[PDB]
Design a binder for this molecule. Structure first.
Ligand SMILES: Nc1ncnc2c1ncn2[C@@H]1O[C@H](CSCC[C@H](N)C(=O)O)[C@@H](O)[C@H]1O
Ligand SMILES: Nc1ncnc2c1ncn2[C@@H]1O[C@H](CSCC[C@H](N)C(=O)O)[C@@H](O)[C@H]1O
Ligand SMILES: Nc1ncnc2c1ncn2[C@@H]1O[C@H](CSCC[C@H](N)C(=O)O)[C@@H](O)[C@H]1O
Ligand SMILES: Nc1ncnc2c1ncn2[C@@H]1O[C@H](CSCC[C@H](N)C(=O)O)[C@@H](O)[C@H]1O
Lengths: 341, 343, 343, 343
């Protein structure tokens, strides 16, 4: 199947075991911004659901399917590959919605649906939008979408911006500096200092921060889920040109994302921006091993290259240069292994 | 191999990926109690190493092998199955010990070692001593040990003691009761509350605690690594009879462990007890489904049965009863997926 | 031919005596009230050691100590000064009507001819970490003019050293060096010099003061007796130390200060630059390890601080320190002539 | 050599020791205005470098030579007399430019270059442009310049303007009046007050200031590096006639400088004016011993005479008079020892 061909079994085992825990489903459900904004997107656009056929990709507890049922959907196919599928069925029955929500256990790349659907709903967003590679499952599911059918969410915007944060940089460098020791219990570790810096700086930093650390207006990269093919997400090239608003050290790039539910009645946005209330996605920062100095008015140009890997994540390459000085940084990050700060 | 036969590949992949991180090796190395005590055990028993042949099972960074070298070992075979083996090789070279330390990449169950050794060293201990099932690799390695040989550590003691912790017990329900509401954004979640409770109780709790929650002297189960066969660790039956020192509600069993290095000069102990400075192993607590009331002077008797599984861990079966009242409780827990509660 | 020129590069000496030829630098020392007031107290409280005696003031600067000796009743004071300040001292002697008692002799004390032997030598020859500037050798050299029965003011000098923890200072210095880790400074890869940069920054002793709570063990004391010592004794100063750690943590280096004692006939007067005492223009001095050492309370930190005199009127400092229980060792080289004034 | 003949060894030793520190090179490199403007001048005039032969006089770290290489230079001879030369060589190798950059250790007055060059680059500017006398080394290097050749920078403009700053002027006496006391620890210091005043006024003041303290449009003195000979810088006579824009007391002259890189594509300016972002050169102020009252519309005429000395600096003589009143003041300053006032 498309899923198995792009995924190491070890990764998939761990992945679906994770989502098989009620505590993890609870953790997502209790993100009120997320869950509440999905409910608002679906109910405020009830006409996009009324008497329609719906596909919920990765239904987990079933919560989004219940929202579709509230909005008047005729039939909702709720596809879920983890053992959580059986718990969703328990809820469908206990909520007397067996006539409207049909749980389909399995991977959306592998199951058979009885009919085409009018609209697909999902919450496939990971850290930095793309982690977990579930957007590919979401896009894959369009094989079941009627022509002119809709996608909720409809588009995704990734935002990137340069930041200054000496404390974070030193925090990571300090951890790496353990391997600088020439006599740890009598052992010279220093030959590994380079490998250690590489490893620590390969970790994207997941937390939030004060917006005043951003040194330029963000650059936007948009994925249109109505138009995109899953293949489009195997190699994501994001060029950027920042006009520096402040002088200082650029320690790296900060990432966040918005998704929009573009319904018939209104467009509803779910944002993970640092200007907005915190979600369980927080924000993500990719550190440079060495910061770049820029003055206000300079331009910081480069590319963020995301290569999907078989562990359901991405290999991140960031290259950035201050155009006026040729000061350049290149970095490699492993999105699967973030530092939760 | 013996390893592959007892381990699901997925588990092994994740396991050795974990130890391939310098950050995880560092985490262990910076546990000063652990690393310092190993060093002390090896150096203070230098006559057990001087001019000897040594096997380091799962050498990681190589640190214990460097200690064996500090103690004068003639030759050290350092076996390591994760990619960390290449970093250990770098350190052996940079510390000018290529004549003394040989890194062997691979599983100790699978590699070829050329000769028998005088002593095996290893740090194979997991949570509750047995988690990760690496003690079996350690014992397996005795195929390379001379009959007169030694094991460092030489013995391992797992300690169990009953505890009272009302807040810990109540917490499970507080979390599970998320599901006990009729209209979460319009949805009745209550049908899943029992399943949520069950899930939380299946998780051993990793953190530390005030020793004043302990209600009796611990019961000790000793593995003698010189005498034990790896097969001895597939099923570990730990009967216990606690002589209650305090009256109250027993909410479960607390676990910790000690290991001893029994050398020619002295015995050195490494302890993860809650009476000792904290280590990266913390301690482990397993809840009963229902607390048991016990009076000071009562006896709390039963069994903790640890059944090895192919996820490099154990299923923990606990049965306990107050002998004087006949009140009984049990739990079955999954050690592979503990709840890390520590703050 | 002179002892001074034989041990001193001309460049260093020119700069050195130019520095002290400035009235502003003399003013700076004079306005150190602890220093100047304590010298005055030492001399006046021991006036019977000066009354009707012959005095040599080694490096008189403005003449201030010679004026104190005159206040204490000295019969004749030879005030030797090699910088152009000698001419300003002469002006003050005349304007204070002390021409019959204070005789300024311009030149280096190693090179001038004095008319008679003296009863007592006074000087302020102490530099940073006591020994910087190597003026203590000039002070000791001057003993060729001292009567067998003679005294030295100050009489002894105590150097104190203690381990300290200060993550912020360490990080502050490393941050400066990290400039040289850049792979693309305006397009230029600087990183090949990162090692040289770290060495250079960490070679700088840090002159400032600090909270005594950063100290992790009781100080070790090294005493120089100026009555007994010979010049040659200061070419190589070896200070062994063994610290009993009172606190657990990272040792980022050794902190240094010094006391001198004026051992007079009436009383002993102490001038201290300790961090427990009011600040002086000597502040205190800290020598960083390039890599900190972890120690727990009860551990011992042992090693040697070796000072090798150099021709730039200072010392090459080698500090080697080891945590005895673990063999964790740090070795560092500092250039005392060029400290980082952080205050 | 020309260098040794004009420089006291003592000065030269200290001077090249200073530039041998990576931290000092770093200090200059991190002056973004300076470094960035050099890079811009070189890169925006790439046709002056593309496939050309270049001489870098005093390359330090090598940074300007790397800029010349970025601009496409065929060959760059990078001359450096301090031990920094060894580090520059490390950078040339690590940046894979050994085929294009040749580091030549030594003084430019003493080394041999294998061929003539098309363009000379340097950053030889000191305080008030001329301090350090490195401009003479820059001009000396033209012995290697082709008749076709260019100089980057091409011209240097020193600007001078009268300023009012009552607080700066009064500060000198506040400091000097330390000596105006009859009993400093019993000593009458007053006889040295005049010498102290003289000493403070002999120091040019390095810092920055509000442009509103300037009382007239600056007068400019231009050195054309294409045309000037070394000898032209031994005696620099700068006549001035200021037309006062503001009425008030003139406390002295403020100095700054600009350099221009006059390339084939464009002229690029590097300015240290008080109207521009600050550089590590700040600005320099020389006080008059006595301020001069001038009315708006009055003229302040005189001369600033800079006499080179063998300490790689200048003796500054300033004489000024208000033409309408005949009120006159002067000062003699020592540029080698400025007072760094900036905070
Ligand atoms: N290819 C795939 N096919 C089916 N389910 C998948 C899948 N990839 C991920 N999933 C499931 O998708 C869910 C993502 S978490 C979102 C859960 C729920 N829709 C909510 O919004 O609360 C998980 O339960 C995961 O097991
Ligand atoms: N069967 C096996 N064969 C070889 N190495 C193994 C193994 N089981 C576990 N390991 C390795 O054993 C190590 C356990 S962690 C101990 C590391 C190091 N000896 C120290 O004391 O710091 C890990 O690096 C793990 O990869
Ligand atoms: N070898 C030497 N011979 C003579 N003077 C020397 C000397 N070495 C140092 N000096 C002088 O000693 C002085 C040290 S500073 C102390 C000055 C003064 N005695 C006071 O206590 O305030 C300086 O003026 C310095 O020039
Ligand atoms: N006569 C001379 N010959 C060679 N190098 C000299 C010199 N006079 C000064 N220098 C060197 O010139 C440098 C001046 S500082 C400028 C350094 C570098 N070009 C930069 O722009 O960053 C110092 O390193 C100093 O040692």
């Amino acid at each position: 199947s498309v899923f198995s061909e792009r995924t190491e079994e070890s990764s998939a085992v761990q992945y679906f075991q994770f989502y098989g825990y009620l505590s993890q489903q609870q953790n997502m459900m209790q993100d009120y911004v997320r869950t509440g904004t999905y409910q608002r997107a679906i109910l405020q656009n009830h006409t996009d659901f009324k008497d329609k056929i719906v596909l919920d990709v990765g239904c987990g507890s079933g919560i989004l399917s219940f929202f579709a049922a509230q909005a008047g959907a005729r039939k909702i196919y709720a596809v879920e590959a983890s053992t959580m599928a059986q718990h969703a069925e328990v809820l469908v029955k206990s909520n007397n919605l067996t006539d409207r929500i049909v749980v389909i256990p399995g991977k959306v790349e592998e199951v058979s649906l009885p009919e085409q659907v009018d609209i697909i709903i999902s919450e496939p967003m990971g850290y930095m939008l793309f982690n977990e590679r579930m957007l590919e499952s979401y896009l894959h599911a369009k094989k079941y979408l009627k022509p002119s059918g809709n996608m909720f969410p409809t588009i995704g915007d990734v935002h990137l911006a340069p930041f200054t944060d000496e404390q974070l940089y030193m925090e990571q460098f300090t951890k790496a500096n353990f391997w600088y020791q020439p006599s740890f219990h009598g052992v010279d570790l220093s030959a590994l200092r380079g490998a250690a810096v590489d490893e620590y700086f390969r970790q994207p930093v997941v937390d939030t921060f004060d917006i005043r650390i951003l040194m330029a207006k963000s650059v936007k990269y948009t994925v249109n889920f109505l138009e995109a093919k899953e293949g489009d997400l195997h190699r994501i090239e994001i060029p950027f040109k920042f006009h520096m608003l402040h002088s200082g050290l650029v320690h790296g790039l900060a990432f966040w994302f918005d998704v929009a539910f573009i319904g018939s009645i209104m467009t509803v946005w779910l944002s993970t921006a640092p200007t907005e209330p915190l979600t369980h996605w927080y924000q993500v920062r990719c550190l440079f091993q060495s910061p770049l100095f820029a003055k206000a008015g300079d331009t910081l140009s480069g590319t963020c290259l995301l290569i999907a890997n078989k562990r359901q994540s991405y290999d991140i390459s960031i290259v950035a240069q201050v155009d006026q000085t040729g000061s350049k940084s290149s970095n490699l990050l492993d999105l699967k292994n973030p530092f939760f700060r």
